[PDB]
Nucleic acid binder design. Structure first.
Lengths: 213, 95, 234
RNA sequence: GAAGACAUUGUCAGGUGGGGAGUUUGGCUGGGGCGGCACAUCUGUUAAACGAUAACGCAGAUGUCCUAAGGGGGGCUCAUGGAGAACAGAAAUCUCCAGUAGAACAAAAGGGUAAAAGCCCCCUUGAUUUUGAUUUUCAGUGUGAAUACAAACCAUGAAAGUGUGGCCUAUCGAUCCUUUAGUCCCUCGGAAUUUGAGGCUAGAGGUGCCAGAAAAGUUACCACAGGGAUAACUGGCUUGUG
RNA sequence: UUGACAUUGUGAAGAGACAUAGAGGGUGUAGAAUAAGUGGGAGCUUCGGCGCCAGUGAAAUACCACUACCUUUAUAGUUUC
RNA sequence: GUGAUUUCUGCCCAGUGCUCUGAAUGUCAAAGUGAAGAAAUUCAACCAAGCGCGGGUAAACGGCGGGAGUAACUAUGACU
RNA sequence: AAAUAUGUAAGAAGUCCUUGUUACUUAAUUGAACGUGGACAUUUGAAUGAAGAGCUUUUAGUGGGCCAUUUUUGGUAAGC
């Protein structure tokens, strides 16, 4: 709870383990949070790294599609399909628009809708996990998929999600919790007023918990 | 109609003066209920029956409110400065 | 708008029966527990309540009931709890048979018996079964009720048959229907009554105009029409 | 005998409630009405070569749109002949060359505008703060709009400059109330402390009848005060129409 | 018309208050395989189970904290429905 | 309500009214409860009717369409 | 590109000469604005008219107007 105990989630919580000495292999810590919890559309992000610094952790197939040319916008990589003859029948509704825009990351496709997005395609999907975000959709979905694959930084969109990092095993305290904060930027604060906008969260590394608030 | 979030609109405050990028949101509303003098006195009827007050209120609107542009620097440290763009409908930065 | 009829009467106003032109009155008497005698001399012809009311017993030192279709101008009107059942007599319906049919009969014990006192209509006691102390009684109405054990009871079909099985041929005879009760006849087919007059509301090319059901609970005045109903056509 | 904290009675709350009470129902108008807005505006004309100027005069535009359709400097110059044609071949679109401003400047119309005021690039956010003065009814009334200054604070150019919003002439709103932005300034009056209330200056929230009431009909059952200021009928001009 | 509060006080069956959380845990098409599911995850623990850099699909998991179903479980005085 | 007898009561319940135990769920006031401040006070959750959802209802108010083609001179409609 | 009508100016407080003030901008003997001392006014196109002239308060009525000649708008026209 943004208090002294931050370094109790960090410093005092960095060698908890669950057995004997402390092992003999590398470490793996971070600092959990989110993306903005807005609705993955209107406003929740912009630009600027923390860091932070990471990438996947497990899988990365997100979202990118629109026309017959959006497939190759997911061929030399791996993404979801919006289909062509579906935006007039079933390419969006609940578990539909989901499918294409409901993965884990967010979305990195382009744009093309017309008079249909106030309760179907572009619509039903927003806070679900996608609704047309900033993925430099013009050359494709790879270069700006540096904001959708690796490096990172920590593009935090769709539904929660983000990253963190600072050191290895044991050598951080005030800058461990203050490294977790450092592992937060346009995700912990931003422009006009943004020093906080949530309730709680989690964190650790592999040991056991962090802040007991 | 495509505004651009923050843009160096000189300004001041002061205890600052000169320019300063300002995160510029538009203005919202604000409840009052049970504080407003408007209330403190406008609680009446007078009182076993009532009506309201001469201006209440069915007239004829305009179909176009106004943007309550609310520019606000961060170095100037203050103070959320209001502006007035008039033309609806529209929306923030596109573009 | 004036005060529409209905609203109008009720209060003393100018209407109220023949409250000084008839014979005695209903009265199944007062209440002892084992039969008293009743020589019923003469059956009366009153007004209003067609169906002869006939004046009887007077025993404990020297009353006038409504009399079921059974007068032997002296008839065996012995009645009172423990009492041989019969056309006439009047035994506490808490000790009847099962399929009988009393006429006059008292909601609640004693309190002289009015339920189905009218011309003819009798009240077949159909039930008696489920009874710690009560009775499953029919009723002229058409619905059922559990009256209360020992409570008077006519014992036979009320007199005066088809008092009106027909046929009041002429506007007269209404020569009566009155000289009886209130001045109910004639009755002013309301929807001629003008706007301000009653609620109807004539208007130009006639017209009962909008609605006609009339929510139960309207302002005694918004009232009238078809009370408040659960239907319409035939 | 029946009823047995119930119901009733009482006090507030909510439904409901033309049965009842009260109350209202714009205007300009070849007479009222249905209609149109010369009720707020702008261009052209009508309008008689300064200005002013009428109709329910004629021809048209206004209750927006622009982050750039704003701001500065660069460059460049916009709707024919003669050349080269493969889906082009009347051309839709491409590249060469040699001359009327016929184009373009969001939107009506008129003004204006050519190393530009148009078009392609480059860099910004002046569409800024404080005032005040000015101009716009022949103008003494506030409003909107616009002009030149002062003080600041920026842009842009190498500069001199220019830029105080869209080339100019249209595109908007008092009075209590409410919200907000302002110093962290002023008072709650027996003293304090915070919480709250109140104030000061700069804005948003609506008044289109746009100098700004908050407002359904019907009467043939009806009523009043006045209107030849105002219509049916006579007369009257005029005579298209006969 | 409906609620609350007074008018309104004798007794008797059953909740909730004092003064509690833990386990199997996921029946569309495809990956050998557990889908309302999130991600921190390159590691948890003297083994390597699963991973993971590969990953398809509507959504990937062991180190598991969690925005949310089913089954499964303690009262002695006043109190109050 | 309609008006002797005589005959004869077509079809429409979506609309407005009326009216039923009904609806697995959404509003919905006062007291009563919880949460937060130092309170004033301001947020909460549940909450009777009512509403909205469901049904019946026209001797209840009232309703009762419209255009195309369409042989055995010709016009023609039981046809579609 | 007229006519009619419409702005200004006029003899004259005016020029001409000498220098002095600082916030102004010029590099300043640069000017600007202001002021001293000094020459000439009744003045040699303007005309013509003055029952002075200027100035301050106040407070009636009025706001329904109608004629003509020329110049025009509508309309066949009009005592429109």
């Amino acid at each position: 709870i943004t208090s002294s105990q931050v370094r109790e989630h960090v410093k005092e919580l960095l060698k908890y383990s669950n057995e004997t000495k402390k092992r003999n292999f590398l470490e793996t810590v971070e600092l959990q949070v989110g993306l903005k919890n807005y609705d993955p559309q209107r406003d929740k992000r912009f630009s600027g790294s923390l860091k932070l610094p990471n990438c996947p952790r497990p899988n990365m197939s997100i979202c990118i599609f629109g026309d017959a040319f959006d497939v190759d916008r997911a061929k030399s990589c791996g993404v979801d399909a919006m289909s062509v003859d579906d935006l007039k029948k079933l390419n969006k509704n609940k578990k539909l628009i989901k499918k294409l825009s409901k993965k884990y990351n967010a979305f990195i496709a382009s744009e093309v809708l017309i008079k249909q997005v106030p309760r179907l395609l572009g619509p039903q999907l927003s806070k679900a996990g996608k609704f047309p975000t900033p993925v430099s959709h013009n050359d494709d979905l790879y270069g700006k998929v540096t904001d959708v694959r690796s490096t990172i930084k920590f593009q935090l969109k769709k539904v929660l999600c983000l990253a963190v990092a600072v050191g290895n095993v044991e050598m951080e305290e005030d800058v461990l919790v203050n490294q977790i904060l450092m592992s937060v930027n346009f995700f912990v604060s931003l422009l006009k007023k943004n020093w906080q906008n949530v309730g709680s969260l989690v964190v650790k590394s592999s040991m056991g918990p962090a802040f007991r608030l | 109609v495509n505004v651009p979030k923050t843009r160096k609109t000189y300004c001041k405050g002061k205890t600052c003066r000169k320019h300063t990028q300002h995160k510029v949101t538009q203005y919202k509303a604000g409840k009052a209920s049970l504080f407003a003098q408007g209330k403190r006195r406008y609680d009446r009827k007078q009182s076993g029956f009532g009506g309201q007050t001469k201006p209440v209120f069915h007239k004829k609107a305009k179909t176009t409110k106004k943007v309550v542009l609310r520019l606000e620097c961060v170095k100037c440290k203050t103070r959320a400065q209001l502006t007035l763009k008039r033309c609806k409908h529209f929306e923030l930065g596109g573009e | 708008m004036g005060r529409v009829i209905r609203n109008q009467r009720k209060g003393a106003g100018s209407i109220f029966t023949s409250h000084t032109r008839l014979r005695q009155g209903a009265a199944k008497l007062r209440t002892e527990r084992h039969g008293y005698i009743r020589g019923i001399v003469k059956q009366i012809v009153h007004d209003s309540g067609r169906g002869a009311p006939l004046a009887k017993v007077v025993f404990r030192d020297p009353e006038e009931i409504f009399i079921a279709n059974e007068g032997v101008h002296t008839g065996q009107f012995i009645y009172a709890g423990k009492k041989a059942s019969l056309n006439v007599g009047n035994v506490l319906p808490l000790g009847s048979v099962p399929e009988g049919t009393i006429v006059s009969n008292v909601e609640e014990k004693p309190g002289d018996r009015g339920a189905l006192a009218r011309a003819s209509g009798n009240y077949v006691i159909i039930i008696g079964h489920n009874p710690d102390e009560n009775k499953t009684r029919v009723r002229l109405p058409s619905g059922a009720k559990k009256v209360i054990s020992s409570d008077a009871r006519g014992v036979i079909g009320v007199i005066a048959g088809g008092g009106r099985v027909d046929k009041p041929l002429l506007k007269a005879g209404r020569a009566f229907h009155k000289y009886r009760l209130k001045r109910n006849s004639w009755p002013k087919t309301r929807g001629v009554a003008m706007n301000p007059v009653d609620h109807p509301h004539g208007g130009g090319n006639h017209q009962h105009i909008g609605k006609a059901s009339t929510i139960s609970r309207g302002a005694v005045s918004g009232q009238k029409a078809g009370l408040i109903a659960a239907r319409r056509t035939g």
